[PDB]
């Protein structure tokens, strides 16, 4: 929680901690008043929606994590709120607990990575060592997040502080050293996380065709 | 497809009873409950079912609802009730908030009371004597206190210590304490603290003679 | 824990989480190794001594808080020292868990305070307020707490924020308005505690006599 | 009644093994268990019964016990393995604890290995040419990276990058990017990237032809 920044068009879910109880999620643009969105009741595993969202809240639930999300679709800049989990008795028509908000702003200036390989040279030192990578160029705001092979490879790695060029976009790279000999068999893929645009890319890094 | 309007706007002093209304057409037909809400924060439940008090929330808070007109009460309101209040209303339909209010609780100008202190008879017998000097809740923080032995002046033999603001009524207060020896304590009689502060119309002497009732 | 200063001839409280596993008690002079105590086994209710101590080492415990204490008494200056709880299972001589140390440092300059009374005035206001106190002086180091009648009475209390005097020591006030109608028949006793000097006291405020 | 006794001082770099002994009359006849301790935190348990090691205790540390002498053994140190370590006996008696060993993980002058990285073909369908030096597991912290282009030197056209001192090595390592647009990229043959630091004797540069394999 805390703040998340989300680009015109993306979604933003909300979750949610899920007996006779209903969860709510209400929202709170800066400086204004308390906004219903929807609800859902763990006990009959039924939604309620709000008109005033057409068809952009989605509501779904997880029995095994008793969790309940609240999905909102196809933002915009009048999306800019808070967002808050809450949760009263079954038909009473109040809410006793408040879970922390979440403030959502909406940006028209967020922009999703472009993701390049750094592809290991070929001339790399036989039965020494090889360095790749992922350069992750052109997004807005921070952060992104990379991992190697969903996190399963870690030593070696160095993810670069981002460096704000001077189009006002960020760029990092993320990279490797591995053995050489290892280039012919092993697989190497990053894992690219821009949570503002909802980008989600793997790349497969291999050295370049001759 | 009602709405609910809440004045913006209510301002108390410590200790006033505020009032914050709910209007909506029809609304006494209705459960309403009510939320505070600090900056930052996620809202609290104050009351519900009009008037019923959750667990833990101080009893000055209660409320009412008949007619077109639902209202939250606090009694002796303290600094920290100053937040934002939602009324939320309930038809079984919809779920609908009022706009808010925002409670300010104001801090304007107040004297101190002003009390001395002689030292303890105990406190002699070891040979020192503390006089002490108290502004009572005062505001705002700026005081002036100069003590007098038989009239004179005294300069370096005292230290000042002040509270941070009070959390129920946002005042200050301020001891000064004055340190002489038994001996010299035994030498004069008058033992005077003048007190000068924005509130008074002119500075205040509270005094005190030596072995007296 | 963190850090606690202590006059030479107090003593220390070190207090336990408390089957078939041993407390221990182990310290650390600053820049030194480590040095046990002494020890207390909870199935048995027995405890176990460290001859360099003296009789100094006393070793309780409390079957319903499930807590056991060391007290360290007639501290010295080179009981300066971190104290550790450790525990480890019964017979197998090691210890899986360390909790967090204390830091107790046995100092000279420790002074417990004289308390005096700041008794309200016989010219208070008849059905007004009355103001009362305690002065609590001449101590070293801070803190001092005060509270008055075990803590029951909080409402028209002010206590001061220290002042360090031109002897070096410290000195406070914690007074009370009261209605001056009470006067004569309702009771006020400032609860004054300063932990360095192992100084707990209870003094009555009453309008003095004439 | 008796005493443990330890070198004061163990001192390796990154990827060696530290050996740390623990001496006393007769060791080998009892049971010895190894702690670590960072600075103002409490010792944590990572060897016991000579050689055993408690759940989450990584499988570089291992132990022995034999003769006057137990051995706290740790192979590939890392860094973060800096920290005081004390053996501890149990005879039965008497719990006793050696006077401990500071470990120091030395970091010493490393010269960086230098990698150039072409831009993609995906990359260059786009307009935008990036050329990619890396300088890997260097120290200490000062570095220069002048890039060159068909022999010409590079000014303004070049960003960097560095890491926070690596937990296992303690080691930097920095990238260094030049942006061109495609048109320049297509304009040259020779991209060169030249590095100075302190563990070379003198700058070394890589480089390679666009279009080449």
């Known amino acids: 929680s805390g703040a998340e920044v989300k680009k015109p068009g993306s979604s933003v879910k909300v979750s949610c901690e899920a007996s006779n109880y209903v969860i709510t999620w209400v929202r709170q643009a800066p400086g204004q008043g308390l906004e219903w969105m929807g609800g859902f009741i763990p006990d009959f595993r039924t939604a309620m929606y709000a008109q005033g969202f057409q068809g952009r809240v989605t509501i779904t639930a997880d029995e095994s994590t008793s969790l309940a999300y609240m999905e909102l679709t196809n933002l915009r800049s009048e999306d800019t709120a808070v967002?808050?989990?809450?949760?009263?008795?079954?038909?009473?028509?109040?809410?006793?607990?408040?879970?922390?908000g979440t403030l959502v702003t909406v940006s028209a200036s967020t922009k999703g990575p472009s993701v390049f390989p750094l592809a290991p040279s070929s001339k790399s030192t036989s039965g020494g060592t090889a360095a790749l990578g992922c350069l992750v160029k052109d997004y807005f705001p921070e952060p992104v997040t990379v991992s190697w092979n969903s996190g399963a490879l870690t030593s070696g790695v160095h993810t670069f502080p981002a460096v704000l060029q001077s189009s006002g976009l960020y760029s990092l790279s993320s990279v490797v050293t591995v053995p050489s000999s290892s280039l012919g068999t092993q697989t190497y893929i990053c894992n690219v996380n821009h949570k503002p645009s909802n980008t989600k890319v793997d790349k497969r890094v291999e050295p370049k065709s001759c | 497809s009602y709405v609910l309007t809440q004045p913006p706007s209510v301002s108390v002093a410590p200790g006033q009873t505020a009032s914050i209304t709910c209007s909506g057409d029809k609304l006494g037909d209705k459960y309403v409950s009510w939320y505070q809400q600090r900056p930052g924060q996620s809202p609290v439940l104050?009351?519900?079912?009009?008037?019923?008090?959750?667990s833990g929330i101080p009893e000055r808070f209660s409320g009412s609802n008949s007619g077109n007109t639902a209202t939250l009460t606090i009694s002796g309101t303290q600094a920290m009730d100053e937040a934002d209040?939602?009324?939320?209303?309930?038809?079984?339909?919809?779920?609908?908030?009022?706009?808010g209010t925002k409670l300010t609780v104001l801090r304007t100008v107040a004297a101190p009371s002003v009390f001395i202190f002689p030292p303890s008879d105990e406190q002699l017998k070891s040979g020192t004597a503390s006089v002490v000097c108290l502004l009572n809740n005062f505001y705002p923080r700026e005081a002036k206190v100069q003590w007098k032995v038989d009239n004179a002046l005294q300069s370096g033999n005292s230290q000042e210590s002040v509270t941070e603001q009070d959390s129920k009524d946002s005042t200050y207060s301020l001891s000064s304490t004055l340190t002489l020896s038994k001996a010299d304590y035994e030498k004069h009689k008058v033992y005077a603290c003048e007190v000068t502060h924005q509130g008074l119309s002119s500075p205040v002497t509270k005094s005190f003679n030596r072995g007296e009732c | 824990s963190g850090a606690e200063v202590k006059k030479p001839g107090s003593s220390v409280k070190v207090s336990c989480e408390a089957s078939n596993y041993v407390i221990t008690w182990v310290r650390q002079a600053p820049g030194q190794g480590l040095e046990w105590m002494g020890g207390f086994i909870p199935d048995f209710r027995t405890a176990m001594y460290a001859q360099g101590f003296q009789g100094r080492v006393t070793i309780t415990a409390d079957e319903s808080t499930s807590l056991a204490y060391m007290e360290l008494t007639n501290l010295r200056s080179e009981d300066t020292a971190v104290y550790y709880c450790?525990?480890?299972?019964?017979?197998?001589?090691?210890?899986?868990?360390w909790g967090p140390g204390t830091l107790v440092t046995v100092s000279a300059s420790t002074k417990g305070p004289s308390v005096f009374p700041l008794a309200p005035s016989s010219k208070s206001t008849s059905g007004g307020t009355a103001a009362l106190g305690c002065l609590v002086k001449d101590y070293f180091p801070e803190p001092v707490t005060v509270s008055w009648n075990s803590g029951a009475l909080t409402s028209g209390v002010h206590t001061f924020p220290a002042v360090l005097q031109s002897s070096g020591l410290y000195s406070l006030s914690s007074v009370v308005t009261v209605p001056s109608s009470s006067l004569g028949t309702q009771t006020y006793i400032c609860n004054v505690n300063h932990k360095p000097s192992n100084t707990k006291v209870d003094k009555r405020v009453e309008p003095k006599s004439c | 009644s008796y005493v443990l006794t330890q070198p004061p001082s163990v001192s390796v770099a990154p990827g060696q093994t530290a050996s740390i002994t623990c001496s006393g009359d007769k060791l080998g006849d009892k049971y010895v268990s190894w702690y670590q301790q960072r600075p103002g935190q409490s010792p944590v348990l990572v060897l016991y019964?000579?050689?055993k090691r408690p759940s989450g205790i990584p499988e570089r540390f291992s132990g022995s016990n034999s003769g006057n002498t137990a051995t706290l053994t740790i192979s590939g140190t890392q860094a973060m393995d800096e920290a005081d370590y004390y053996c501890?006996?149990?005879?039965?008696?008497?719990?006793?604890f050696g006077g401990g060993t500071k470990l120091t993980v030395l970091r010493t002058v490393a010269a960086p290995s230098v990698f150039i990285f072409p831009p993609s073909d995906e990359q260059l369908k786009s307009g935008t040419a990036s050329v990619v030096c890396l300088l890997n597991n260097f120290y200490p912290r000062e570095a220069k990276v002048q890039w060159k282009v068909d022999n010409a030197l590079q000014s303004g056209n070049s960003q960097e990058s560095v890491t926070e001192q690596d937990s296992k090595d303690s080691t930097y390592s920095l990238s260094s990017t030049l942006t061109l647009s495609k048109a320049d990229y297509e304009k040259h043959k020779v991209y060169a990237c030249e590095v100075t630091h302190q563990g070379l004797s003198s700058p070394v540069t890589k480089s390679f032809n666009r279009g080449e394999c």
């Open positions: 019964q000579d050689s």
């Open positions: 501890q006996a149990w005879d039965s008696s008497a719990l006793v």
């Open positions: 450790a525990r480890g299972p019964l017979s197998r001589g090691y210890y899986d868990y």
